[PDB]
Design a protein around this ligand. Sequence first.
Ligand SMILES: OC[C@H]1O[C@H](O)[C@H](O)[C@@H](O)[C@@H]1O
Length: 403
Amino acid sequence: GPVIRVAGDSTAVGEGGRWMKEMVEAWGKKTGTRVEYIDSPADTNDRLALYQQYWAARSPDVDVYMIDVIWPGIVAPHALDLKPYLTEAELKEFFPRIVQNNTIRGKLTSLPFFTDAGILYYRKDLLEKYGYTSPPRTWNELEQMAERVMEGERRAGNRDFWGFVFQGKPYEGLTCDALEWIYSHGGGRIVEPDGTISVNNGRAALALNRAHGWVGRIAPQGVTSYAEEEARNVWQQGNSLFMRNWPYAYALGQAEGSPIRGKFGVTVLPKASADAPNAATLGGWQLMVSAYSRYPKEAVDLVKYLASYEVQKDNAVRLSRLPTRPALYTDRDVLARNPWFRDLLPVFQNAVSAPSDVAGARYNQVSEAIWTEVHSVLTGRKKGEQAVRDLEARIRRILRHHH
Ligand SMILES: OC[C@H]1O[C@H](O)[C@H](O)[C@@H](O)[C@@H]1O
């Protein structure tokens, strides 16, 4: 019979690839359908380039892809329209915001699978050790706490200890981190939903200068090459007071044998001042049936299974990844394992999107300009003032004539 082939997630990032292959094999076994899992690189922008090779070729060699929240506008021609396969009731079991994100010119490109939001991880043991009763609410507090804890821990002999780790590598994750910095300083959304390129302002510049101020000071010098896993590994070994990262790192940090099990909490990222908005960049992954699949009916059945209540539940319980079904956020088992899903639900609801809707199919070019200009500030090559001016000019060129 048919072999249903899936490219989604990565064995190079936590347990995602392993768990994904597990779920796909379970569907295979339950339905009597042969399946194959194709692995992907860690970073989303590398995955896009890979999958683009299959799409350009109209390749039938992958039936189902896991696609980023930022991709629907790019990948829509390569997606089978799922709308005819779901009832209105079925489709309403997902968050409307994500279904809308995934719907391009009326085409439902993909089902919501898991959502994502950037959050602050913090070592509760260390805050208590150094006299702090709450995680930081402002970036200045984060810096003050990081400096004091680092001084103490370095003095006690942990030469590997840092204050803060994050994603500073030149790739999509830096765009995510940087949107949070900018937005949390009152600097806007880089490109606003209405099309306005707003990033050339003093608040955005300050946010970038502040981040440069971390590098080699409270954050490792090598943070400028860190993606999600590099940051997680320093944190997870016990060597960072703070980390910015996504939900998936929670379950990994709690696993038996983690040096930091039971020593950490999560909260909203800090912000410049009390009246700035809270920033959490909206991430997440969706399930797309290939327009080039020879087996659309079977592939849709697999995508419905993967997006089902019980598979999303497993993803939440075992991998601490955020459901795209509101009903899971009241599930007793999801909540007992991850109580912070309830505490931070409003953070997740107010998460801020990168400018993929407004940039559409040119989003990957916009984002590359963003991470390259931000990176040049993190390296000390440019000041924030110059970088946001240069970034405005690049984005203007990229989006000229885009409506
Ligand atoms: O590295 C950036 C990526 O991180 C996570 O995978 C998010 O879910 C995704 O939306 C984002 O693009």
